[PDB]
């Protein structure tokens, strides 16, 4: 009743908030609108299942677009899926194999490195993420990096001595989070409609699982891409 001080009372309920008339739409249970600290609590609790990857760059040559491209050229990115092929000069004398031209490139710049593309999407391209996360028991500190070489009136928002509130350490974290916790209001979805498992296999397989599990991952991705690809 200290860290988990707000949710603890209601976290285990049939409908999480039957009443709580401020925090949800009502008993129809259509929409919700939490305050910050309870959201923080939820986030902390969700550490095992939470998306837990803020650097949007990370899914590089691993987006749905990338998967589609891999499909469309049979240039399967080995961490991800491999499909049935979409279909059924350039001589060794001529070209100079200086760069061994990899499949990863063949989906990155699909129209260039992969000649004779068909039905090929264009993937993203991106900026470098320096979202520095804090460990515990402090705030606003350069840790992971190095420092630079070199008429009676007060400034704005005077009499606000504390720069950081006790929740803003967590609020910042929340702000950097992805779509589930990102926000402090939403419409409900069916338990069914929440994908606790999609976020694991969409992001990359952690470290040195048995071959069978890797295969499983690939299979899952193959399903996912198919679902994405034939919009119903």
């Amino acid at each position: 009743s200290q860290d988990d001080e707000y949710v603890k009372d209601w976290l285990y309920d049939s409908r999480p908030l039957e009443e709580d008339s401020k925090k949800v739409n009502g008993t129809s249970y259509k929409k919700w609108s939490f305050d910050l600290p309870e959201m923080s609590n939820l986030y902390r609790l969700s550490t095992p299942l939470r998306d837990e990857v803020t650097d949007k760059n990370y899914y590089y040559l691993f987006d749905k677009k990338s998967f589609f491209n891999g499909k469309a050229l049979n240039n399967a990115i080995p961490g991800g899926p491999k499909f049935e092929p979409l279909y059924p000069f350039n001589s060794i004398d001529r070209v100079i194999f200086r760069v061994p031209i990899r499949s990863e490139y063949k989906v990155a710049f699909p129209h260039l490195y992969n000649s004779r593309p068909r039905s090929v999407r264009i993937p993203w391209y991106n900026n470098p993420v320096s979202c520095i996360i804090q460990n515990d028991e402090e705030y606003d500190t350069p840790a992971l990096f190095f420092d630079p070489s070199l008429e009676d009136f007060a400034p704005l928002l005077a009499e606000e001595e504390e720069l950081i509130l006790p929740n803003t350490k967590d609020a910042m974290s929340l702000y950097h989070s992805p779509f589930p916790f990102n926000r402090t209001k939403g419409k409900m979805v069916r338990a069914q409609d929440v994908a606790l498992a999609k976020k694991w296999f969409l992001q990359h397989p952690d470290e040195e699982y048995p071959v069978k599990v890797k295969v499983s991952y690939q299979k899952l991705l193959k399903n996912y891409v198919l679902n994405e690809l034939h919009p119903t």
């Binding site: 609108s33 910050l36 677009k65 260039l112 999407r121 264009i122 993937p123 993203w124 391209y125 991106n126 900026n127 470098p128 993420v129 320096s130 979202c131 520095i132 804090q134 705030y139 606003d140 500190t141 350069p142 420092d147 630079p148 070489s149 070199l150 008429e151 009676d152 009136f153 400034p155 704005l156 928002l157 005077a158 606000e160 720069l163 950081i164 509130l165 006790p166 929740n167 803003t168 609020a171 910042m172 929340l174 702000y175 950097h176 990102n182 926000r183 402090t184 209001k185």
Partner: protein, 488 residues
Amino acid sequence: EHTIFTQLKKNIPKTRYNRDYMLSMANIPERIINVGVIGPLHSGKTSLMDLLVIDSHKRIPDMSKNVELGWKPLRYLDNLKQEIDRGLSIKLNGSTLLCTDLESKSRMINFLDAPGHVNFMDETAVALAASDLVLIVIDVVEGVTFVVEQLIKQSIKNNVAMCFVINKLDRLILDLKLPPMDAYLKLNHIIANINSFTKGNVFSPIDNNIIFASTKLGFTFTIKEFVSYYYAHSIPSSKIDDFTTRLWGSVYYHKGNFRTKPFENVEKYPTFVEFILIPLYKIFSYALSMEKDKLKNLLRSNFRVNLSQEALQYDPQPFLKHVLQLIFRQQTGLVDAITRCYQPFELFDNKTAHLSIPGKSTPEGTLWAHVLKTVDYGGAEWSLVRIYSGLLKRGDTVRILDTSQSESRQKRQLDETPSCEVEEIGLLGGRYVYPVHEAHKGQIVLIKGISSAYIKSATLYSVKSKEDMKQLKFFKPLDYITEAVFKI
């Protein structure tokens, strides 16, 4: 219909000001700034442009709900299917915006959100060639990398005014979570770098050269802007200039009513930190963490800001964005920064000379214009042309010369053989060609009939005399800063 898209319609999104007024304004030079915003890859320059446009127009169709809220950035100036799907600005999709300065004045600007990626620098080069001021934009995080330096060098070598935008403060306040003094230090380091690169004019927040932006949250300010907004009530009319001069450049308020230049005993931080950066921190910290009622009260009191009852129930990012918008009223400070920076119009001569040749008897009234680049801005062939003298009217015949035939022509002078009509004229505005009959001096417009008369980067002219023709000169081929050496 089509995939690679624009507006293609009668009902272009209506503007707050009226486009008749804008066009009227565009009758005279000394009141048409060609900005051509520039920077590295993912500077935020396109996002900045989007912010400006949104600020200008009433309701856009493309401004969906999410973008309005501020989850996704309304990248209004990446119209190409590709430029969306790829996540990069790729071609010049500028806009003509009747922009209000901080001081009461109305100037129509020709922005050009050029590409940042360094393979596309070719395209960017055109913007430099086009634009008379350049809003260089920089990420705080990456700072001034080599690309920025290169850009600066090009601009100085291309003889163009420079007015910098240190962008994405949201990152150093939330991503890096820097303390405010640290942030200040970082800023100093950056600006130091800028100064080192720019051997001539020295840039700073004072003199309104630098602009402190965050296009995701959607706010830019000059110190002049911010000061004007929130340090006009307190301090008197005349002493405001002094205050502005003080804020930035290591001067500490000293807990007292007239600061010292050196160290202070009681407080630690500078004036810039204490009187700007610290406020931003307070805003951000409170616009996430602070119990909303309290925040509302503070806004009511100090900033004189009323939160919408919807905004109280926003999510913490979009709420924050909304608050920021409320605080820093428009992208007006930015415009002030531009105008003030490009108060030299004697640089025009330098520019023109650089482009074509050192010459005179140009203001005889002979209409002539640098055909900058062929674009496909509404799908169809258009030619982005910057006019210098005279004015072009719709359904007029014109002499055009590809800058392949420029040096040769010059040599030959010391018989206007190629020629073409002007089928239609219009104005780039992110996603629409807004048709206009007039095409006045010192501005950028799009024309139909030119395109096929040349390959790339032409000149045009229409002399009323052979003597006049003798007096003419012709632009050089645009030296596109990157040389193409990727052979496919």
